Amino acid sequence: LASANVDFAFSLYKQLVLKAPDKNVIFSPPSISTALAFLSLGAHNTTLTEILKGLKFNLTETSEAEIHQSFQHLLRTLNQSSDELQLSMGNAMFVKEQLSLLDRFTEDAKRLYGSEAFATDFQDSAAAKKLINDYVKNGTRGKITDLISQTMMVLVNYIFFKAKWEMPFDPQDTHQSRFYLSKKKWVMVPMMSLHHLTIPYFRDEELSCTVVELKYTGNASALFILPDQDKMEEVEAMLLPETLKRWRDSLEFREIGELYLPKFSISRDYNLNDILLQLGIEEAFTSKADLSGITGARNLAVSQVVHKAVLDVFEEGTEASAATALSALVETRTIVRFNRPFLMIIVPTDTQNIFFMSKVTNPKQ
């Protein structure tokens, strides 16, 4: 169920951070989950089993069929670009001209993942690569080749997101301010702010961090976690499903005098080969790969999996795209200030799933 998608998200995060301990992180779990399951559609035996288990499903409790039904359901709900909250996701395949495929593969891909097919000419690589990159701004790509190569096809999943803050910031309350990277180093950042507000709050003394929730208009919210100084590594160590359930259950309305949140934008390009290997998905990258469900023959193998994501946080709200754009200072009562490394998780209000995960160590990066 959705407990698999959340479980998969924290497992991925732990590995990305071990790869890079002091850089910014940004990724979309549901895009990476759907792409892998889209691939597993033409897989068999051990190759199949490693993918489904790598995704954190309990096979002793769920059949393969039920798993594809869940993703079909997940796709029908997401697509809702109208109620002030825009969210969209699609799948597609680029195939080399004159490449035979099994009727069942083509059919199921269509009925379960809404996949489209495009006749592609890879012999003209430079142009074939640009077309695919332009088609996928935010998303995941799986390059498939001849067992043991060239390029037979590329599977893809893309996502878009745009939302409005339920309590907008005013461009006139944004001021240049400090942001400490270390306990003695900092940079200048546009700091937004709100005054005299009541929002859900909770102080986690166990992990030494502060949690706050800012809603968007529509069925979604953003959670911001502020670890005390030199405590990020300790919060990261306990980033598990249970902790999330506990933070969301402990939130209580409280009044704040001032809230300062930096306006930023971050993007990342990931090569996921090593990571997936660390999670148990191995055989599909070898000669022993069993992807006979695509063309009928065991002559295909996965060579490369990449993920790309962009996040923009500003006065009006949040968007998964790039940016383009008196003010008298007050200081009194209580002051929550996100002027040091923090975490941000975007989750739907009535469900236990996550659309975006990110950590901000340096906003000017």
Swiss-Prot record:
Plasma. Synthesized in the liver. Like the related alpha-1-antitrypsin, its concentration increases in the acute phase of inflammation or infection. Found in the amyloid plaques from the hippocampus of Alzheimer disease brains. N- and O-glycosylated. One of its GO terms (cellular component) is extracellular region. Its main location: secreted. Residues 326-332 are annotated as: O-glycosylated at one site. It is found in: Secreted. Residues 317-337 are annotated as: RCL. Disulfide bonds: none annotated. Pfam families: Serpin (PF00079). Residues 183-185 bind DNA. GO terms for biological process: acute-phase response; inflammatory response; maintenance of gastrointestinal epithelium; regulation of lipid metabolic process; response to cytokine. SMART domains: SERPIN. Glycans are attached at N45, N58, N79, N138, N219. Gene3D superfamilies: Alpha-1-antitrypsin, domain 1, Antithrombin, subunit I, domain 2. The record marks L326, S327 as: Reactive bond. It comes from the Eukaryota. Alpha-1-antichymotrypsin can bind DNA. Although its physiological function is unclear, it can inhibit neutrophil cathepsin G and mast cell chymase, both of which can convert angiotensin-1 to the active angiotensin-2. The reactive center loop (RCL) extends out from the body of the protein and directs binding to the target protease. The protease cleaves the serpin at the reactive site within the RCL, establishing a covalent linkage between the carboxyl group of the serpin reactive site and the serine hydroxyl of the protease. The resulting inactive serpin-protease complex is highly stable. Interacts with DNAJC1. This is Alpha-1-antichymotrypsin. It comes from Homo sapiens (Human).
